Design a protein around this nucleic acid. Structure first.
Length: 65
RNA sequence: CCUAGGGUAAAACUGGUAACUAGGGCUAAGUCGUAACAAGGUAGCCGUACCGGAAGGUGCGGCUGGAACACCUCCUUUCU
């Protein structure tokens, strides 16, 4: 129930990795709540805006299944 | 020359009164409806706009000074 970004030394969230951005998304392409992943709020905001940036850049789908 | 008094002109303050007219408090509790008090039978109230014999109704925003119900779809992590 810890933060995978506070445990490691990662300070940025890249959006050009569709394979890496699949760990914070639902099975149908929805952002997972930070309660299930233990991520702090400061990094949850960043991962949410990164997911949205990937959706805009057409690396992750809006409506998936 | 000065100045009491008198005349004249336009204003300011204030009192009384007036056809008609708006609202307020009581009287015997007359006529019409039941708007609020229980979730008052459409939750209530506040600001505002429109409308209607009347209490009032509706649109937008805000509050609980409202009752009854009221824990969860994903289970766990590697420098991307």
């Amino acid at each position: 129930k810890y933060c995978r970004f506070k445990k490691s030394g990662i300070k940025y969230i890249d959006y050009k990795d569709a394979d890496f951005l699949l760990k914070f998304v639902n099975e149908q392409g929805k952002i997972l709540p930070r309660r299930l992943t233990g991520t702090s709020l400061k990094y949850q905001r960043k991962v949410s805006v990164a997911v949205k940036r990937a959706r805009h850049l057409a690396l992750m789908p809006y409506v998936a299944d």
